[model samples]
Target: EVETFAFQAEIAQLMSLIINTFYSNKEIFLRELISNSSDALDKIRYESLTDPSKLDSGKELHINLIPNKQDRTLTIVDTGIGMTKADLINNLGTIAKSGTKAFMEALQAGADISMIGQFGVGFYSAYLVAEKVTVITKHNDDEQYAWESSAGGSFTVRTDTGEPMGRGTKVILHLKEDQTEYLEERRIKEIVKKHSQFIGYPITLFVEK
Candidate 1:
């Protein structure tokens, strides 16, 4: 049910900065992703209470982390209101929320990025480790789709050929060798506790190391 929008030049610059050098603690990427997953779960929980039909496909909402060491892949999947292809481009490609602009402006005024940690730039943090990232998503009102992108700028969208999760989104990251720290359960747990312990939903960390 989300609308779509395009990213302007400034928005692209912001994304580049975020993906390239915004955060000092690269480990915080796990926290950011988990926090985003938590938000999705929270929305589904509220929607289920008011319009239980919203969860017609399945209501059990939770975050799951899957690590594949052989392939050097990590996936974070969430059962929430999965995005449409348009939703992926708008939300992931551009800055649609007014709050993101406000936060950026404030940060420009000397406000510390650490202070405004409530902002939802979490998705971009995936580029901290991923050389290539794939997003598989299914929405209640749209067909399943896959989105592929690299921090290098170009991205692609295609109809999903994989098994559907009924509803929700999954992010698969092809991590770099130096980024292998993210493959560790202990590291992921510590990062989650430090950055997302107060998240409103359960955040699970799975690893293959």
Candidate 2:
């Protein structure tokens, strides 16, 4: 049900830069993703303009953080414009796809910061705290799919064999050894306060304490 894919040199290099040079700012990963959800939600709203049925998934527009200390995994779920299989590969398989060559040069330059408008690097930030990352999503026009990758090396994608994940994107981060701090309830609230406080939709955290 799944197929494996390898990241090109540019992606591997960018992941290294994220896990190494950008280590101290691991929390930025949360902001990067939450903002991403917001962007996806915005896109869905815009797309709904033409096809009202696209937004008829019977779920409210929201973001959820489900942190399970027992399993040691943190999941972020967003009811946004989800990605189809092709979008998953095109968006996640390559770093900036076309601009990868020039993007790396910019990353190498200590100006090395703040260019997260459209580049795919923001997604790779997951490597900062997660040893294994899993993405399960459902686009309105396609069946559900799951995308995954470990701390290093290649990534994978497959047709989901589990229960339907409704509609939108769900990212599960199996935190690394020293990154359990991400599972703490208050710590996440603090991070959201500092970074994603401006998010318009409701942000809920399901912490099993």
Candidate 3:
């Protein structure tokens, strides 16, 4: 079954603030996203250490970037701990449910600002350069699902019938006007090398010949 909901009041305000004021560097979106992918991979790997059966046996952990200039799309795929439907709702729709307040309190206390993404707002940074975002994910315990939004305080989640991702997430960003630089392979490669070179997983870029 599919579901839709509006963001909680605090979440709406935070999303607006992120879109309008928070991040000065829009390109940082990719870095934040890759960081998230690495974290997810770390989580699944950790879980598998305790219970070998918890792992997706056939999926090799890695990240893939597919840029399509013709369609003005950039897709980031990762073999990692994908979210279940409930995870998406709690993680993305409710500000209080996330660590936003703790992050803010830490900021107020002069904590290390680099750790801001521990609050989960890093995902919203994609709206800085994309008109809309689509996330297709599959978790070991749940069917594949798609979550989509335009940073408008509301989103929809529905079961996906496409080919199974096995266990992972794929994020498709529909680039905004004047954000075409993100679709260039050279530009993306430079950004990845600069911002995500330290990531433990292999980051592959798909480029046209």
By the lDDT metric, which is better: model 1 or model 3?
3
Residue range 88-184, candidate 2, lDDT tens digits: 8775433455555566667677545345434656777787889889999998888999999884768888999877866889999999989999999
| 40-122: candidate 1 lDDT, tens digit per residue | 77767787888889898787788888888888888999997788777777765334355467768878888654543456565
The better-scoring model by TM-score among 1 and 2 is 2
How much does candidate 1 score in TM-score? 0.83
Model 1's C-alpha root-mean-square deviation from the true structure amounts to 3.8
Please, what is the TM-score per model?
A: 0.83, 0.90, 0.87
Best by TM-score: 2
Error of 3 at 135 (Å): 0.9
Error of 1 at 206 (Å): 2.6
- Indicate whether candidate 2 or candidate 3 has the larger TM-score: 2
Better of 1 and 3 by TM-score: 3
Ranking by lDDT: 3, 2, 1
TM-score of 2: 0.90
Candidate 2, 50: how far from true, in Å? Answer: 3.3
